[PDB]
Amino acid sequence: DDFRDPQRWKECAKQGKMPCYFDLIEENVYLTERKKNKSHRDIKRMQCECTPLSKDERAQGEIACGEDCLNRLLMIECSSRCPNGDYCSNRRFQRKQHADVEVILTEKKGWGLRAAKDLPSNTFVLEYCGEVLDHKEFKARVKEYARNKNIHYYFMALKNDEIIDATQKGNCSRFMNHSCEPNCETQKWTVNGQLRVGFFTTKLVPSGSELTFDYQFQRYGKEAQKCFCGSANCRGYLGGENRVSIRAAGGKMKKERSRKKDSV
């Protein structure tokens, strides 16, 4: 049903059976990246405190860096300098250990995902990957794109000044829907000094059940949208009722201390 092939095919827009109208994407890309960060001055290395054995697996064998590691509890994946080396299990964004996903049609609200097999809680599913914008381009491209009459906006605010677009290029995590009864959620992990957004499960999801995540509600123009799930209390509407501004939607830029002019 997914069938990732590099040849472009005859499916217009819905991307349900032919995924090669747009392009896919690996770990995200940047535009104006400069060397002003906490990367390699104080977060050079954050090594866990573990005294392993690593010579007894498959018999009296505890998995390395489980839920007692200092980094997993604080949402940090280990580096290559781990005392376990190539047996540590924290590095899940680097070894690309994913979950079995599939994209078919469930409801007329749109496309989504349904679980293939059983999946336990606190299990990683997919990484949100896209194109990283910057301060000036967001408020221009959004008003340039609102006049194109599109339904889906693939914008996610990483920080108060960073918004990731998953429209031109997107992985399999772009189809996941919204519901007022969430069973998956989003977490902010720190890998190699850079912040990444991942998807974790919360319960024991049966084989053949929905996998959606809760939106932190937001609206951007004058119109409103509504959800079609209706689990038991569903808030009716994507984005709620309350209106917020262009800057509040994106997070309003950390103003370069120039001038006042930019606020006006």
Added chain:
DNA sequence: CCTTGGCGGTTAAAACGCGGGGGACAGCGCGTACGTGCGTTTAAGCGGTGCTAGAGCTGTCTACGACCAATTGAGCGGCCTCGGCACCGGGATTCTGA
């Protein structure tokens, strides 16, 4: 000189049982204090240029302490001396508990 050791008697003391009240403990609903997040503002550090107070390094020389002889009286001790205080008793007053 006084420490370790010994036998012996007195009775203050520690250990043992019991009743049952004191409080240590798990559990719950609730209110808001402190957090994650985030725009705007203050002023913390840089570096550059400049002045100079005050630390630092040469020279004097006499005020000050160490040392020495002779003198002798102040402080440590031995020995009686005697009264401030504990000990014991009869009694009135405080305080706790049901």
